[PDB]
Design a protein around this ligand. Structure first.
Ligand code: FMN
Length: 108
């Protein structure tokens, strides 16, 4: 299947993105100059379910893995359905260093 991949830096408090695959930009229409160093939430919009967004917010705070189905928006405003799976990467001392996300456009 067609998927995308990003890396969030958990040492910084708001989990900014530090790496995105070629597909992530092409899927969403944002360039690296407007993605890197920002929280992934810029992809959200009016129809994003705040109950689902809360599920990721909690999991990141707890440091667990999570999977949600969010409504996102490209740079041109058009919506797409992003199945998102976040995964915590821990150092050997249990501390969370990075979060990693796989995004799949499941508008079908
Ligand atoms: C986003 N992908 C994504 C990828 C990673 C690795 C992480 C950690 C988060 C995301 N998000 C969610 C966003 O960063 C944030 O965690 C949530 O908005 C909830 O937190 P807040 O503080 O806003 O309540 C992704 N969100 C998307 O909408 N699309 C993704 O591709």
């Amino acid at each position: 299947l067609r998927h995308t991949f990003v890396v969030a830096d958990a040492t910084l408090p708001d989990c900014p993105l530090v790496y995105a695959s070629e597909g992530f930009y092409a899927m969403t229409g944002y360039g690296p100059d407007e993605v890197l160093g920002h929280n992934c939430r810029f992809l959200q919009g009016e129809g994003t379910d705040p109950k689902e967004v809360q599920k990721i917010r909690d999991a990141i705070k707890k440091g667990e893995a999570c999977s949600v189905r969010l409504l996102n928006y490209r740079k041109d405003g058009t919506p797409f359905w992003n199945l998102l799976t976040v995964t915590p990467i821990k150092t050997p001392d249990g501390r969370v260093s990075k979060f990693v996300g796989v995004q799949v456009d499941v508008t079908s």
